[PDB]
Scaffold this active site. Structure first.
Site, PDB file in Angstrom:
ATOM      1  N   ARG A 147       0.980  -1.259   0.325  1.00  0.00           N
ATOM      2  CA  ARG A 147      -0.136  -0.285  -0.541  1.00  0.00           C
ATOM      3  C   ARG A 147       0.686   1.072   0.074  1.00  0.00           C
ATOM      4  NH1 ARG A 147      -2.184   4.129   2.597  1.00  0.00           N
ATOM      5  NH2 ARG A 147      -0.939   3.613   4.334  1.00  0.00           N
ATOM      6  N   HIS A 205      -9.412   1.584  -3.285  1.00  0.00           N
ATOM      7  CA  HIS A 205      -9.716   0.194  -4.121  1.00  0.00           C
ATOM      8  C   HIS A 205     -10.835  -0.409  -4.780  1.00  0.00           C
ATOM      9  CE1 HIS A 205      -7.804  -4.458  -4.180  1.00  0.00           C
ATOM     10  NE2 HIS A 205      -7.167  -3.514  -4.281  1.00  0.00           N
ATOM     11  N   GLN A 246     -13.148  -1.084  -1.869  1.00  0.00           N
ATOM     12  CA  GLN A 246     -13.950  -0.177  -1.020  1.00  0.00           C
ATOM     13  C   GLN A 246     -15.356  -0.285  -2.285  1.00  0.00           C
ATOM     14  OE1 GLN A 246     -13.004   2.302   1.071  1.00  0.00           O
ATOM     15  NE2 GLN A 246     -15.080   1.593   1.384  1.00  0.00           N
ATOM     16  N   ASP A 252     -17.479  11.957   0.325  1.00  0.00           N
ATOM     17  CA  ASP A 252     -15.829  11.579   0.399  1.00  0.00           C
ATOM     18  C   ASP A 252     -15.242  13.772   0.839  1.00  0.00           C
ATOM     19  OD1 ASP A 252     -13.110  10.635   1.190  1.00  0.00           O
ATOM     20  OD2 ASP A 252     -12.609  10.696  -1.092  1.00  0.00           O
ATOM     21  N   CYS A 266     -16.363   7.228   3.302  1.00  0.00           N
ATOM     22  CA  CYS A 266     -15.341   5.680   3.140  1.00  0.00           C
ATOM     23  C   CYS A 266     -14.462   5.963   4.466  1.00  0.00           C
ATOM     24  CB  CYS A 266     -14.391   5.861   1.914  1.00  0.00           C
ATOM     25  SG  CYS A 266     -14.039   7.690   1.782  1.00  0.00           S
ATOM     26  N   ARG A 303     -15.517  -3.664   5.260  1.00  0.00           N
ATOM     27  CA  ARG A 303     -13.392  -3.181   4.348  1.00  0.00           C
ATOM     28  C   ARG A 303     -13.348  -4.959   4.727  1.00  0.00           C
ATOM     29  NH1 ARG A 303     -10.237  -2.481   1.189  1.00  0.00           N
ATOM     30  NH2 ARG A 303      -9.503  -0.493  -0.275  1.00  0.00           N
TER      31      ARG A 303
END
Lengths: 329, 329, 329
Positions: free
Chosen positions: A101, A128, A131, A225, A267, A314
């Site tokens: 990552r 990702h 997600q 977001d 998120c 997740r």
């Protein structure tokens, strides 16, 4: 960025992962979870500290019987005296799987084809496919109705990864998704065409407006977001805040849906108050924002909020990938 | 430094570890590996970050059923408010084994005799006996012929730990080893005598030249280690580079062996290109070195290169030590 | 600070934990220890590095079959972009237990009642009830006689957490405890009353003097803790050192007890010499202190010293809490 991986997957492939995640989650809750990664060793190699998606990965791995070596910037100097290329090629002979990552999408690909073993291309923190699977699994779980019947909208900078991703995902799964943003913060229209294709053959309702009340219509889910630019100094945000404060998720935007069942998703992390150090810095220049930016303390600390259930998902989504790629059935 | 531990071991003792490593490696590959460290807890206490030998240790320990607590400079302030002496004496009552890498060879000895438990004296990163066992196990594995029949050479600064160690090891095992360096970078000749003793009674061919083509004769293995001084500023390396660039391992030195089977080994890390941050710094002052220093990108990214298999063998060698010292058979 | 948690517990409740710790310790020593936390995942979230109480926690958890995710300041930026409140609420849905050390006593309470799971309020490093249980378990173990018959004293700043805690503990368990300090470094007398209550109904001998030979009478245990102020610059300690150097634990204070069986205890870390970096800094300004502050190198490196056995007992005490709160019997 990495949603050209989310484009090659079919509705039926994505549905296989959503089913594995749904069942793995049910197994853990009912204590029927069999360990399929017993005795596997997994390296978790992170350029930046990112404790939420690290934990999601560790817990997925430990529930499935695996061991983990976390390597953070704290504990490594990867790229200093030793190539990332060299270090990966040593670890790929010791570990059964490695997870990179950060580091940019370019080199992770390089050290992947060498690898005698699975090498996950930013399976953590990255906006990702994982997600998108968590989010769809969260919405599927809460409406208890067919995926293709699910109505949701994203509010804020439709050009950023969550917006593009939640739209492409909606188009793949045949869902009713609305991107709602300023007209100058809309995806580059050739992307909007690739999504309009998938949506015809999957039967998804796409709909990109700039009018809040349009998008917020009878949606099961309201998503946003962070849209402030953390790259740029706080001094210069004024113009940005002006463009988007319309699109804030406040109690009024929840009511605007006239669905008293509607849920808010995010998120994370989420600027919703001044508890954070960067909160204080923002709210000192911008006292209007004491109570939140993309979303308000009112909505965040309310029952409409299921972002924490979604963060949990997740972990089950990561586990479903790990079990798919290392468990042998 | 710590090759007065490698001197008290007999050929038959060292052969016991090489056999345990060979069999443990075979067990993992065929999935017949029994856990003998089940329920053991091991502390891994590192002064410097060193992710390759940390991982080798963790994976050895997890394959054998053990748990691990990694303590890096990141996560500790050992020696600040609390003596290293005090901290060790607490951890020695909680852990079944402790492993100290860095801190100097002096104090590790102190807190070792107190210890109601195994305390490994720099079992990791250290140009350790474990490094020599990995290298001999690597060469033994690739030639499939008796150890004493194996021919290898080290090129570069014969005075540094890998050179001294690979020579002493050759002398103990009765192998054909050549140190090849400038005549002023040769071990202090009293050391060269202690090795000449062992070699008579074990029947090892020692041979320390300064002529490349001599040493590179019919060898199965060509070895080098980093010979630039990381202690000193880059500005002043010119003199050093001039002395040793003869001894670089390039394609020509491989061919010079006229053995098309020959293999290159390197304990790592290896300056072989400019991918690293220190690479760039070196190559900015020294553009001749864009393509490598002690060894070239040509050889490193070629099938002659088995350094990664050799790094792997540090994990099976570390495991063979851990199982020997904690497994009870 | 957190000894209003130690006040609500009865003698019979505290005795239940001391028994569980005594038996868990006996089980590990005789290899009869059953894992009751098999498959549980525990987050260990630390604001400061603290390797002794981290290890105590990890080892308790691994002996009982649990997994652990250590998050240090090294590996996290908790409170930076994301509230501690938000991060806890995500981790509480992934982990079976979380442990917060540092962060102040205020917020840990907040994110605790939300929690669908145990959230330990500073179970580590904190001058915790767990520290008192270890100390009482240590004294109980070494005298092999009824708890209420045990005689001990604390020497130094009676106002600091170990002093207050060792006194309140003595009062709860009906033991013979003496706080021995300068009269201006005595607890605020309303606290000294709450302890005098418990002591009547439990039958504990409380006794707070400023005369060494009084307090050191026929005690089984002599205790001290660091009394220098690490908050303030070394330059200004003179006045403090003058007040307390009387109360140093030296060989003479051991003999003053005229019990040749007596034991010294110390929660650690302990300034007893100059091995540490802060040792050197202190001893450079204050050469009288080369040989120790609250306690001497003579006593610390002598058989009267059982501080290491006592540090070990924090691991069995932590385990007894973890098993009580997560093991289901």
């Amino acid at each position: 960025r990495d949603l050209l991986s989310l484009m090659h997957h079919s509705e039926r492939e994505l549905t296989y992962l959503l089913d594995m995640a749904r069942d793995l989650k049910r197994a853990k809750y009912s204590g029927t979870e069999q360990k399929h990664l017993l005795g596997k060793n997994i390296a978790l190699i992170f350029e930046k500290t990112s404790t939420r998606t690290r934990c999601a990965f560790e817990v997925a791995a430990y529930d499935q019987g695996a061991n983990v070596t976390f390597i953070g910037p704290n504990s490594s100097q990867i790229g200093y005296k030793e190539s990332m290329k060299d270090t990966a090629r040593v670890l790929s002979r010791m570990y059964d799987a490695i997870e990179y990552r950060g580091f940019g999408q370019e080199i992770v690909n390089e050290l992947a084809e060498y690898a005698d073993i699975p090498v996950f291309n930013g399976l953590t923190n990255e906006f990702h496919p994982t997600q998108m699977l968590a989010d769809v699994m969260t919405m599927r779980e809460h409406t208890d109705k067919s995926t293709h019947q699910i109505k949701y909208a994203y509010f804020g900078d439709a050009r950023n990864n969550m917006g593009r991703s939640l739209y492409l995902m909606g188009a793949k799964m045949g869902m009713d998704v609305r991107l709602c943003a300023p007209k100058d913060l809309w995806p580059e229209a050739d992307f909007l065409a690739t999504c309009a294709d998938f949506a015809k053959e999957s039967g998804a309702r796409l709909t990109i407006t700039d009018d809040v009340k349009t998008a917020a219509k009878d949606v099961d889910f309201v998503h946003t977001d962070v849209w402030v630019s953390m790259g740029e100094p706080i001094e210069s945000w004024a113009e940005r805040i002006d463009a988007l404060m319309a699109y804030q998720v406040n109690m009024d935007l929840i009511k605007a849906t006239g669905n008293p069942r509607v849920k808010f998703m995010h998120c994370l992390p989420a600027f919703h108050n001044s508890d954070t150090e960067v909160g204080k810095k923002i709210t000192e220049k911008y006292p209007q924002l004491a109570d939140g930016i993309e979303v308000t303390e009112e909505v965040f600390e309310s029952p409409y909020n299921i972002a924490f259930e979604q963060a949990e998902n997740r972990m089950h989504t990561i586990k479903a990938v790990l079990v798919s790629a290392l468990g042998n059935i």
